[PDB]
Symmetry: D3
Subunit: 282 residues, 6 copies
């Protein structure tokens, strides 16, 4: 049984940027096939629709078990446009978004949509005077580390793999669709870190990443004084740089304990596990 | 006028992952329109062909000024195939790959297509016993930081931006296509850094990332002993982690001098520029 | 003219812990005389009452031109007790506290009191499981580095030094009493740092120290599960240690420029100033 | 039952600034009660006298089991005075000071009072050109982090906690008064660290802390050349800054082995203990 | 018995600098006696010969069991002259060198000479515009840190100690002379690190150090543009500096596990061993 | 004219390890010619005498303009024999040593000997239980870093460079030989650092390095308790490691200001100078 899916990427979110590859890390998974379509960073209602179109168009011949839409803020005009377009289609779907999507959480639970909401996947301080192309990449590097090293990506990966198994049953009922809200507190009900302090550091790191969103919003929308909003959006980035460093420190702690949890995929798509470095993943 | 292009992403590369977004960081560039399609990590000749087919098929009603294919090693089966196809299209193309693509560098200039080969966009330690989803994201986060902070991404940004202008002139000839190879010494032609040690550190960070590739290749393809190849690929990731630190340290030196070079796009697509934090992009 | 004041300290805060010393760092000011009194970490309406009485008690003979009450949460049973005792007395008072005092901010202005609220002065995760004397001290160590190196203490110092000038006018009216609410944005209005990146790292530090409260409260007053609130009060700590790191960084950046602002008191209470290490303060 | 003590503080010391708070970290010990009074930084024999009388004056209604005087150089004019007074009172006393108080170490056990001499509690570089309120605070944050994380505070905690138990016994004899001198070698008699290197890093931290004293004393009392003494006291601060990094490092090693010793006070005053994070204080 | 050897040092190499010392670390061995001669940094033919001549002159009365010649590039004129002179004597000789010695590896074997070529012992950026004494000393401090903490020096000590035993029996055949080529992979099969991440970080450090070689060579012998080769050689030095931090990071992991291997010499020369800090060597 | 000198190395000191090499950092000086002899780490009278006799035997035909003897404790039996032997010869001699050489400063002057005593060149923790070959090399790596990056080596280079010029004129009188004692305050009067904080961090580094000496002596010649001296000598090393980092932070402060001092030799021996990276030495 070969499962299939289509990821639609509109806008830019750390979780959307990795979501699919967290599933096929070495491109050796022979139990799955993906198609990814998007219009880049543009998430306007015009483009957002053009993408879902390419998605439905392709799905015709492709025939996926489900379609994932990932992008920032599921409550915006663009994402909302696609949020509805997918509920109308014949394909089961999941919505990957940030905290700004809790506003439409109940709405998505009714639209019959599945979703994964990453609170710590904060919006970057986009203010021409500050966020140029390089700064953008830099910010996403740090956010990527935080989400990766804290275990958030493993939580996402396990969600999309637990669904691909149900997809193999060609029966993805709305009860089989994910409905997650990831945040610092998530780690409290997991076993990601063998080292306790490595866990509270990952937690402290997630709280900070979440706090970056408010700072970015204030500086991008509320504040309009150039002499005050440029410093604000930049202070948001300095915070994420520390969030990442906190995440890196946690990992190193696992390393010292030789307990870095690794869970790769076998060619058959089975999720294997290991703690010790020289221990085979079984 | 407005320029258009389509990005195809098969397999993953640090540049391939950010290429499109590096041309519209805040998504408020009204003089460009992008589309992105691919098969994720998979890059075998079948998924590749199916992908290039997805791009050509949509290039019909999209009518792109140029098609961009990004992914690891433009000399392997999958990538070579995609070079064959796009080479024989009414659409001008550009190939984005790493160092292993220097083998087919002449064959490409022949196929009448442009290329951007980033030497420091190393191959990761893809070995089931070491690379799981999380570790795969941890690495890309280090590579992203080194590629961005060392100014490599600025090189690529400039590239596709200068092409977008000649594309608005409805004059995309092969003399206008890029034939670039990026490595540690690219920074010597640049003015990226104002502090001499920030550049020297960046050069160091690039040299190290470029070296990472030989280590990943060895562990994945040459060493056959489990006890030896797992430590080797892991050490390749330890090198990339330090390259990122060096890059970050280069960035902080620039902050120290208040000379952080920023080149954001104006709403019309023209690349502005500034050094001082509160300088206002001119 | 020798101004005099009495500091009443109940419970603990980083701002109350160093408030009087920021006014005579080397004990060489011959224009001031302070009398500090407190009941230690206990701030119940019972102890708090005994302290204010002990303060008004000696005040008669001392003759302070103003009295300062410092301790956490101005809207608490103890603090509110002392908050009315001072409004009733014939001594001009100023209330120094954390964010929880904002609920009674407008209430203090009618009581005729002055106030300075240090938002980043967050309450620690005081759970018997995690917080012991050593952990408490470590916490305040980081918190101190934050309030100091971020420039917050130079705000408190400035506020009381200006009040000490009015106290010399033998005229401290309600309009001469401070009414400040310190937070991350407070730096946007000052010229503390010569380096713009030092300030944004400072903002980031005060932004994270302020968030620390939310976590401390969630783990001390909301969460009841032992397996959860311990990791919670401990994660709040990591946040503070990392915030102290960013403060340190900002301070080091000003050092690489030798633009480290220093403002010492002359023996006559005159506040001098200097940026360069080798320049004498004027 | 409940024990009571009064803490007198003139001038500042890292140990005096924390002593009473190291006894009731969470303010939930209902088996003790303390009063705190002082003159702040000032510590001349007059300000000292006034403060000691401010403490004797309230010991009447307070009726303390023992009085404690905290401040630098217990052999100088100010402190010598306070030794006189408290020595001849119906209240048992304890003197907490630094290394310069080893001169009067004989005279103290003579005056019939207990002492706590912290050699690593070095004097800071007091020179108007270098030390402003902030530098003053920053220095204490470093000395606070060293004394706490190196386990020195644990020594003082237990010292006053053990005295507090004999005080509830209605029997505070002079053979029950403490006679201790804390130094790098004090850690050789404890079991503070489960990781030997953390111990060795802790010793190094305090060894460097002790030496900070001579650099300070020199630049303040010996060198009279501006161009030489400013850099000298500054170097004492730089040294202490590094000692704080060493102490932090010791702490982290223990976090890697999850052996962080924690000894909180039970609500009834009896000190508990633990090593593992989720262990629950026994 | 007492073994006797003569070490000739011409030119400078991290390993030739420490070689003899690594064998009698505390100068309390009773089974060895060494003589060291050389011409400092100069390794031209005239000098090398003068140096080897000094050695052979001392050898007459000193009667060395074996002779060691160490210094850069065993294939250069000066070194080659040394190989010819020592291969022509009655004394068993070992050549200590860098990667460039591989060119004459076959030639040294035909000469009955032993050798230990350390590839990570990279040449420095010897350009007059960049390399002054201080920098030359800083580079070597980092290279020394690398060669030691990664375990490369233990390999060298071992090779020699074994040759010292054979010498004690007056049984040193050409087949008893070492023929080693040390590099990153050499660590894969040692019992150096108890922590795997320490080993991995040590390999990463050796890989980088080895790479420094090419960069220095490029900026010293290839690039002729002042504006190009200066930043180039300097970047080589930034690399070594980071290799040293990796080496230190590996050493700090062992400490966290209290598994720092220590193989000290007994007064009788026997090589003891230990792992735990408090564990006595045996 | 070519200047000739012979360096004798008995025992090991950071300065005696690098002294001759600091005088010809790239091996391209045409005005100097050196011969280096020694008995490695052994500095007992028998060895030191053989070392000096080797030197005097060479001097016959080599005819040095001056001779330098380097190694620990000029006052010990071995070094004392060297002093006596050298004082009785016709060759102007200099004695390089550490703090212990101060005991015989008066003797050396009465002997017509020159000397350079580096107090920060501290003795290591030479206890069999803690110091093996690798730890001995790690300590030296840090010591070298401290002495080079703080500029102590520059003072040494200077002293010998001036002595070399006089030698070229065959005019080296006893009054021409150096009589230096280097320590933290030596830096106060040098044009080493452009950044004041760089100089202050360096002083701190030298202060601590000096302190290391006392700690090593304590654990080596005082404490006889295995359980106590082992931790103590190890703490000495931890101190030197931190001193190396201070020295490293200073150097990085200079880089930030692109003000790193480089005083390389010209092919003719002239000591050039420069500050800016791209500036040419002159
Ligand atoms: Mg032979
Ligand atoms: Mg032969
Ligand atoms: Mg003479
Ligand atoms: Mg004489």
């Amino acid at each position: 049984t070969v499962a299939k899916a289509i990821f639609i990427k509109c806008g830019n979110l750390g979780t959307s940027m990795m979501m699919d590859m967290l599933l096929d890390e070495r491109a050796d998974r022979e139990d799955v096939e993906f198609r990814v379509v998007g219009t880049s960073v543009k998430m306007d209602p015009e483009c957002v629709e053009a993408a879902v179109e390419m998605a439905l168009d392709i799905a015709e011949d492709f025939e996926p078990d489900f379609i994932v839409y990932g992008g920032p803020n599921p409550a915006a005009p663009g994402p909302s446009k696609a949020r509805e377009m997918l509920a109308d289609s014949e394909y089961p779907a999941v919505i990957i978004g940030d905290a700004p999507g809790l506003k439409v959480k109940d709405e998505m639970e009714e639209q019959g949509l599945g979703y994964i909401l990453v609170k710590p996947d904060a919006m970057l301080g986009a203010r021409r005077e500050f966020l140029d192309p390089v700064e953008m990449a830099i910010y996403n590097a740090d956010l990527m580390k935080v989400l990766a090293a804290t275990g958030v990506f493993r939580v996402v990966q396990e969600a999309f793999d637990e669904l691909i198994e149900k997809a193999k049953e060609d029966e993805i009922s709305e009860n089989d669709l994910p409905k997650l809200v990831i945040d610092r507190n998530t780690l409290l009900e997991r076993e990601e870190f063998e080292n306790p302090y490595a866990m509270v550091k990952a937690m402290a790191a997630l709280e900070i990443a979440e706090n970056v969103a408010d700072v970015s919003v204030e500086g991008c929308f509320v504040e309009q004084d150039k002499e005050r909003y440029v410093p604000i959006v930049a202070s948001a980035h300095e915070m994420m740089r520390k969030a990442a460093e906190l995440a890196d420190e946690a990992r190193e702690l696992e390393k010292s304990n030789d307990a870095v949890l690794r869970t790769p995929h076998a060619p058959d798509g089975k999720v294997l596990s290991k703690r010790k470095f020289m221990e085979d993943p079984e």
